[PDB]
Every structure is written in structure tokens, then in C-alpha cells.
Amino acid sequence: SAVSIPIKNAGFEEPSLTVEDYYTIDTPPGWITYDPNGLVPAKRTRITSNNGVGYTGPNSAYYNHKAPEGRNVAYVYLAQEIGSGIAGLEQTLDAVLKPNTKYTLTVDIGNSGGSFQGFPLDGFPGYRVELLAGDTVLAADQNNLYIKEKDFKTTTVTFIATPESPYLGQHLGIRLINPLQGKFSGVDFDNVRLTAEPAET
Amino acid sequence: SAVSIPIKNAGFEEPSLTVEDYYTIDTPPGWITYDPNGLVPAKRTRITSNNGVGYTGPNSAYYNHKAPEGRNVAYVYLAQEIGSGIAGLEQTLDAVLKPNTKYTLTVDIGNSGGSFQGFPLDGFPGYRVELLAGDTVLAADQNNLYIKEKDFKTTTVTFIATPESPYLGQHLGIRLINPLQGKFSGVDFDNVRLTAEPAET
């Protein structure tokens, strides 16, 4: 039986937002900004490279339906040209890597779309989801899922750790990445879940 | 209406090998060595990092069954310590990325087991399969599949190119990668397949 591994602010429901105050431009609570190529400036604005939380309700400009989970989704927007680097959000968990364990990391990916006040969100930068142990990427999915404009779709990253793994006992981690492989170059995430179950191995 | 895209030496059937002349330490013909971190030496021996083709019959030392396809499989072996880098095999194809098209890249990943003169092949470095256009990785799977010792399993990488794609007209490519995340640090590949079919959106 698959056991849920606790994640901080896993559905980006913090902070609480309203139809009136419907976004932040700050790293979601419980998450760290991942910016290996320095695309996110020290001084952010809503038009600079940024990440944050967006109230995604039933009358969202950007989606046909409300948030897959709760009220809010996370977003990662990059202003730089295609191919300039990758950036996103990451979180180190308290849980550690166990042998003969199958890990299932599920995340909803959002392709924000439509036109709002005459501006198009048509196009998509792609996505990458990574499961880590320590600072090793154990498993990853980059763009295997196609997401239509104004839709959210669920991707799944799986990994089995064997008794011979070099990473046993190292802290699990998660990264949610915008790889900047298209414009418009915003991608959203919601409802991060991670389970562990016994595996034959 | 799924169209097969030609790949050179896609099953690593070249060169032809015999029971007694059963491996190479040279790059499989039609493929190129992918060595971004310089792990493969200019002059290779059996104990250096290397790659090549191996005959894999129905009574192999390393596998429960014969090669997934034909007589041969490719291998990528890295001698350096876990975490030193990645290497493998890559091929640029004649075909180019086209819009409104779903690409499906299928390849068999092998976890060689058994032993070589009391050198156990127990353990596995992981794998990563990448679909490219030009120099960009469009889509990738790293370690989503678990492969038991002495088995092969099929993985797939899927990508849809939209009309907004920045990579249309660029040549497709394939990379089969040993990410050196474990020892024994050899991983095998066979039966590389790429199809293209109309997609909506």
C-alpha cells in the first residue's frame, strides 16, 4: 500500500489569495527558487522573470477550468530568449531514500492560455519534473506530456531504489522546471504528491 | 497513420559478431560517441570507459534472454567514479521536426547481470533517453523504468511539436545515455524505433 510523503505547501495553497489579490511574485512558501543560470533577478516585477502563486478560479482568464487542486497554482515565468537556461522551484523533503521502494511523484502541469487584455499566452516553454536524492536527479520527465492551451494535465515520475543504491538515506527532493523551450514562456504546476510503496527488486 | 523514421544501425546489428568474436570496444557504426565531460579516452581498452556492440544469444552470461532484436545490443560502460558525468551514444537523423506531429521514441534498456571472470555486473548506472531537434533536448526520460538484473525493458519518449515550436525544420536526433549513477556502471540498449504521426494541437 502506497504511503503519502509529506511535502510543504504541496498544492501552493499558501498564501491564501482572493479574486482581488490574485497573485504573488515571490517564491511560494516552503519552496526554494531554482535558478542555476541566473535568469531570475534580485528585483522582480510581474514582467521580469519570476515565480509565485496564482489564484486560479473558475473564471480565470488563463484556463478553461479552475485549479486542479484548491484555489491556487504555482507559476514559473522566464522573460529571457528561448534557450537562455532553465529555472523553477525545488524543495528538500524530510523523507529519505529507502531500498526496495517505488516512488511515484505526480504533478499537474498547466499550459496557461487565451488572450487577456489583448495579450496572448499562446505557446508553451515546456516542463521538466525531477525526483532527487541528495543533489542527484534520480528520475525525470521532460515534455513527455502534451498540454493544450488553457489546460492542466498530470505527469508521473517513478523511481525504484534497489538495495545497492548509492543514495540510500539521502533526503528526497523535488524540482519543477521551466526549460524555456518556447514562448509564451510561462508554465504552471499544482497538486504535487509523492508516494512510497514496497517494490519487488 | 504512424510513419517510421529511418535510423542508421538502429538495432546495432552492425558489425556482425560470432560466439567467439562477441564484442567490440568501438562506437557502433551510424552512431556517434556522446562524451560532454570527456570520460571516454582517445585510446580505448577493455577497462577504460567505452561503448560498442555485443552479441547476446539465448544462453548469454549477462541476460535471461537473447537480444530484444536480432543478435546484438549496444553498451555504454564508464570506468570513472559515480557522479563524474554522463556519456553514451547519439545519432542525428535525416528527418526534421514538423508541426502537428507526435513523435514516439522507443528503445529497450538492458541491465546486464552475471559476471566477467569473477567481475560481477551486479548494479546499474541508470539510463536516460533523449529526443532532440538540432542541439536541444525536446523530451527525455531518466530512470522512469526499473530494469532488473539480466533483463531488458522497453521505454518510450513522446513529444508533440506544435505550430508555435521554435525548433521546426531542425534535424531530429537520439541520445542513449549512461548517467553514471551506480556501479556496475554499464547499461545496454537495443531496438531503437522512432515514429511520427499527425496530432491535434
Ligand SMILES: CCCCCCCCO[C@@H]1O[C@H](CO)[C@@H](O)[C@H](O)[C@H]1O
Ligand atoms: C507582457 C508579459 C508579462 C508577463 C505576463 C504576466 C506574467 C505572470 O505569470 C503568469 O501568471 C499566471 C498566474 O498569475 C500563470 O497562470 C501564468 O502561467 C504565468 O506565466
Ligand SMILES: [Ca+2]
Ligand atoms: Ca492548488
Ligand SMILES: [Ca+2]
Ligand atoms: Ca500557453
Ligand SMILES: [Ca+2]
Ligand atoms: Ca539488436
Ligand SMILES: [Ca+2]
Ligand atoms: Ca547490472
